[PDB]
Design a protein around this ligand. Structure first.
Ligand code: HEM
Ligand code: HEM
Ligand code: HEM
Ligand code: HEM
Ligand code: HEM
Lengths: 306, 304, 306, 305, 306, 306
């Protein structure tokens, strides 16, 4: 099975586009999905080797049933609202996800324009975020973001559907959440207190010792061992965004995994808490305003459609 | 006189910030003015030499009178609305301009964050535009944009206030206009019809010969000669922007000159027309939704 | 595992194409050089790594093969088949060895070509030498992006490498070369839209024309071929511009690789002889073929073991 | 099994650290080995993609028995001294090797600093070398260095333990030796004479033909064929080092192989010679002052401590 | 107030040299092209800035100047003087117009030479067209570093630009071109040390030989010249390798700018005719000149003011 | 207009600092070396351009100057003056010559230092050799951004280069060197906020502390000097980390250039001896000076003609 470009080289810009499919618009979308690889080539081929343009296309649970009449990926379902004592993870509408990445924003934008040109009249926009990484892989909170993502054989193992669902091998599951930060409150904490929130040193990105690492740190709560005691892993490509005039400072979260169960367990521990921790401390400075789940099929699945 | 970095190396990203100054906000504004070059260094230095971060700071006519006593720059006035027979150039409020450029959007955003943090509670934002150039210096209409800009000595002569206004030497004048395009209409033309609207070939960027160039093409209307037969020139750094979901496809125009009279003459020919040309044909596919005029002082003016 | 030559190279901005004939008695000298050409590639290119991307693909013609080797031949190896169309003609021209030398810069290409030719002096006569250069946005001298629909990854390997259908030669490939010259004055008299009707794709944005407007005699229409089982028959091209401004010579050096020459040959038949819906490829109304040769590129270990 | 970054992309800088483990030092060392991959990601993640920072950790024969219980790598023994008729390959103490590579020296230095801060009080330094390659892949003797290193599947076959030692599949063996050069004597040869020493042309890095190449040239002696005629290969990442004030000009040698017997056979041919060569002529300009052998486990083995 | 042409360019890895003669009646088409050549430079190169580094230096020969312009001539403009020495000669070959086109990539050079010759069709006849490439470590075809002792900065401007001695043509320069072909076979028969004695520098490290052991007939010794006041006389060279492996053509294109041709001419006289202590420059026993022409390269506003 | 040495350099990531004393009888050998150092700079550097960015700046001490030359002396040239403060002391150590060698790669620095030391063998005694490396984001050993407030452009020229006030030495500068050893254990024990109060800038963002909170004993406050008129007195710094992890040596090599040494000396006095508001520079509680010397770096042409 040939996968879509989930395991991409590092990129400094992205566009995330989420849409809903209007009544009667299904045949226009099917035609579009069968052409999306060919559009990615047309826009990116002339800009190699430095443009590094890729699009990952994802389909939600309700959209799947409208578009395809056969079998359904095993793990695919609507994003599941989490209502904890203090923090909530909302569910917002999303039928299609276009996760466009490149080494610059104009390549991302050219691709988006062609895609949405083909879809006009058949879809309704729900969200559009222009992302940009900091020059040292930092997010809006000032911390390095990405360090413990898996790489190589490890990332493929964690991210790509295999034997457990063989008609959908080479697919993945993506969860997306747009988070807005309370930057005034964050910058009133001392460096050392911010380090207890995250679980790693700020300037040098060293993990705090097991003896100092609080139970309600982000790193403690997103660390999960499986039945066999091996680490459970996902691949993130979080992107800063915002608008200085409106005081909007953001992290767009996106996590890929071979089954949503892994990403859903991490979210459960963040929002609902554990025996030792009420919730992830990062949520006292971060509000979720979207939540959607998408299956990203293998590339040949998309090509062989009508 | 040390100028601001009006004369910048080429940049692929930019943020344009326009704000109005709240009543009582005058002292906080003046304090940031005196620090803005120090902030520029602080953000930019550790990302050198590839970041190419600069900030150009401009001040409007009405704001100048509220900030400073003594002399006014001789050409500082509010943007003059143009009401043409078909097309119109609107004037819109603005007291300060921040023109921030770099090789990456994140550097721009960092600097804009620090400036705005210092101004909180003293200003009201009017416009914020994040621009990106396409990888071949093309604009939203598909044409190369920037080709005829002056360079070196010619650029300094065209852009920097000199001996005619000695107190303000090394300053310049900036005119901004945000345009929105009718991309549907534009893409309905043949390439050869588009060429005749701009005045140059699409793929090769060669100027159309004078026997073929229409009187109402953009290059024809914006070509202006002065008394001595010299070309009157400006320096532009137009930037694409937009949003695919709202069908917003724009060009942010910014033009620097040594006196606003040059830019204003070009604008009159475009919007009002001449004897041979009803108006700039680029306007049949471009609507202006802002318009403002600023003076960008010499750097040591700000330091003091 | 028979190691293939570098048929599947990363993107390169420079090439030398060298075609020679082997003189009476030159066989021995040629055999010794063939066994050394992988060492020479390492010697010249190592000290420019990692940016250099220096590779050499060596090719052997049908007549030469019989002169250098005894026993079994590749199943598909014959001389290039002249095509005599009602209007257009594909010529066959002499060539026993092909050196296809690529790199991120022309000096690496030239220095390898000097080592090779040094060793063969007295054994071989030059028939063609072409120094190619890519435009900065992957365009050809006709103004179009060139290479977009080439296969990549596993798809590329399947299309270009000999497998179980001829196991003794597994890991080889077949290369066809033609040098074309372009009548640029006649081309530049067409409107952009008329040019796009000849190729099959939009000029600036390299988007494929819709199946409703694509003419049957366009380039892209005639070089799209499906097999009996409905699979796409694909080749890998690395077309390079070349020329001389003084002599008004503006050219494309065509090179295509495939696992069997039947695929390339079917597409040349379509272009020069036409189908029921199309007299010939309209790209030939502005392009003249002046050379044409067919070569087998053996697996690397075949060459080493000499 | 996931190997360490033996098979690195080319790097222009490196730091070679060799230490011994003091009395009582075992626990501190085991704790650090469990964290080293995490430290390498910590230092290097924010400098990607240009940093190319990696760290290969090696453990010596005596140390292995102090640190771990149970099975031992089959090839793992202390470095074997060779006392030739003219030249000697010495053996010197070393328990742990850190091979730090990157595009720039500061990244190498930052990692070293975090590794050694954790080890302070547990270990004694034996050798610290800051290496820098010349901009055209040349060594201190002025020759391109690295040309015939295997690449790809060829390198994985030559370097990585597999089925012959299944408990330790994915590791490798490393020999290091520090050489000091006599540059004044080297530069007194003509280019042509130097070419005869090495076995390759100096400017063009083309190998001399088998008819010209002398029997005692470096390339001739370090070309070995197995039982089947097949070439025996090692991966090398030799690095220049020195100090202009003390007149120190060096090559730090480092060779990786699936079994030490390949590298040990090459050292025998160089220091003791053959029927047609007395010794490797490179050794008349090059003196070994350290020698140590180490096994570099698969990355998963370290993680699991 | 003088704006020079880009004689003092940054280092560039590609060049095209085009020398043409002006046909009878073509004077007016040439004048109109000279007035547009800066515009053409911008058209081609602007969209590849800042990495492209495209420039064109236009020069005009002595006989052509009197056909094209009326009034004053630059003081040192005369035809190249043939040098007939006892062994080696410097030929004088025809040439009305030079276009020295430089860039970081050959395609930018080609595009610009295409536009120029497109407007000159029917008015000029081509005499020479060379496509130069850099070796990665600034070497020439002889394997020595080429450019080391060129002036830079303030020294360069003083060495190259016409000033108050000829004030109507201030900002101009004088260019001398010679195409050389090398006898590579003979050169490579020398020992490295003997090659060093021909040039006067070490090969590998490019350190100048000390004044006691540097031969008097070494390249460096005969091109080192001191004035009446004892100060060095300098020129600015941008020599470029070129060649064709098939035809055994290994070359250096010599191009040297100076504020007055007397400086370049004294160098050539020393090389070809010799001194009391040197018969001729040893480099000439391995290098044959096949073209020789002299041009005046006006200030930039001189061309556009037409 | 004299030509300065390369005091105003583009940013470099590596450096070698070499400080030697001249042995009795060694004078002539040193003078010969001085007349060639620029030539050696070009020999080593030209083939690596333009990324190599190799430069060397040569300085001469007070006592060495009168041993080497007859006639005039630069007005501000004198031995480094010892500062014996109540707590901290700035030592004077011997040094006759300084080579400040910079490039993008340490190997280029080492190659140039090899040639220079090769020429001086037997006539000089080395006193200090340091190999420096800057961190990827322009930080120093203390983990702060180091260089921010250096003057650029014309202001740099005016600050650093001797002009009309000492006309025979115009285009010269003065260099003060101090090798510092840090107590990194003590440093890393401070919170980030307390380290910010030592330096007087934010650690992550490098924004200067506002004047109401900036301590009077911060490094930035003590090294901020206005002159008679109320103009800011500036120097040009190029400080370089160095060390050895095995011997626990973590250092900053200070070098500072200025047109007259009184500016550097005033800053040093405030650091070590304090003011009415501040006992000493707090950076010295974590920093110990183990070398100290002053040099004149004459104009390049002075060196040439000698
Ligand atoms: C406000 C939103 C978020 C921010 C700013 C954020 C930031 C970060 C940071 C700075 C780290 C440390 C360095 C590293 O990437 O390894 C990290 C680690 C991590 N984050 Fe997030 N995060 C966010 C949301 C989430 C969410 C919603 C999930 C899961 C559904 C998640 C999963 C993880 C995981 C798994 C790790 C790696 C921990 C480890 O194994 O060491 N994050 N996050
Ligand atoms: C409305 C959106 C605009 C777009 C998309 C646009 C685009 C262009 C393009 C594509 C060129 C040709 C290449 C070049 O020399 O840059 C050009 C030239 C020019 N534009 Fe615009 N332009 C716009 C607005 C303006 C306005 C408002 C003014 C003046 C006030 C201006 C003044 C000029 C000038 C002076 C030139 C140079 C003409 C010459 O002498 O060759 N443009 N512009
Ligand atoms: C004394 C310092 C050493 C220096 C300066 C040095 C230098 C070189 C040079 C220039 C080459 C030629 C190019 C190449 O890398 O292929 C080379 C090749 C080689 N060296 Fe060394 N070498 C040293 C020590 C060693 C040692 C100790 C060994 C082995 C124990 C060794 C094994 C090899 C191997 C196998 C090759 C490749 C030979 C081939 O197949 O052609 N070297 N060395
Ligand atoms: C076959 C043609 C040529 C080749 C391959 C060649 C090559 C070289 C080389 C390798 C150098 C030493 C490094 C450096 O560039 O400084 C050199 C220097 C020089 N060449 Fe040539 N050259 C040629 C023709 C010429 C001609 C025709 C002239 C003058 C008309 C010339 C003038 C110089 C000058 C002035 C130097 C600088 C000498 C000094 O002051 O150190 N060269 N050339
Ligand atoms: C241990 C030695 C040193 C270290 C680690 C160090 C580090 C720093 C840092 C981080 C800065 C702030 C950013 C900057 O503008 O570059 C700074 C500024 C400065 N340092 Fe140092 N420095 C050291 C010694 C010195 C010494 C010895 C002097 C003078 C004799 C000096 C003079 C300055 C000056 C003038 C500034 C700029 C102050 C301003 O105007 O903003 N420093 N240094």
């Amino acid at each position: 099975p040939e996968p879509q470009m989930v395991l991409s080289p590092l990129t400094s810009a992205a566009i995330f586009l989420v849409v809903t499919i209007d009544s009667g618009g299904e045949d226009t979308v099917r035609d579009l999905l069968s052409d999306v690889a060919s559009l990615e080539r047309a826009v990116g081929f002339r800009a190699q080797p430095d443009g590094r343009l890729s699009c990952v296309t994802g389909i939600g649970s309700e959209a799947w049933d409208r578009l395809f009449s056969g079998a359904r990926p095993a793990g695919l379902h609507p994003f599941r609202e989490l209502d904890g004592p203090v923090h909530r993870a909302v569910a917002t509408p999303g039928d299609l996800l276009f996760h466009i990445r490149a080494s610059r924003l104009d390549l991302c934008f050219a691709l988006a324009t062609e895609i949405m040109g083909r879809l006009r009249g058949a879809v309704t926009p729900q969200d559009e975020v222009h992302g940009f990484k900091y020059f040292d892989e930092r997010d809006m909170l000032g911390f390095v973001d990405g360090t413990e993502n898996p790489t190589g054989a490890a990332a493929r193992r964690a991210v790509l559907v295999g034997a457990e669902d063989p008609a959908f091998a080479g697919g993945s599951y993506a969860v997306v959440q747009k988070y807005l930060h309370d930057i005034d409150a964050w910058e009133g904490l001392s460096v050392e207190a911010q380090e207890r929130v995250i679980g790693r040193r700020k300037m040098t990105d060293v993990e705090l010792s097991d003896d100092v690492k609080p139970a309600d740190s982000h790193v403690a709560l997103t660390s999960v061992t499986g039945p066999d005691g091996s680490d459970l892993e996902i691949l993130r490509d979080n992107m800063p965004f915002g608008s200085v005039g409106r005081e909007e400072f953001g992290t767009y979260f996106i996590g890929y995994a071979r089954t949503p169960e892994v990403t859903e367990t991490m979210l459960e521990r963040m929002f609902l808490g554990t025996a030792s921790a009420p919730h992830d401390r990062i949520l006292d400075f971060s509000t979720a305003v979207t939540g959607s789940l998408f299956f990203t099929p293998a590339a040949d699945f998309l090509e062989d459609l009508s």
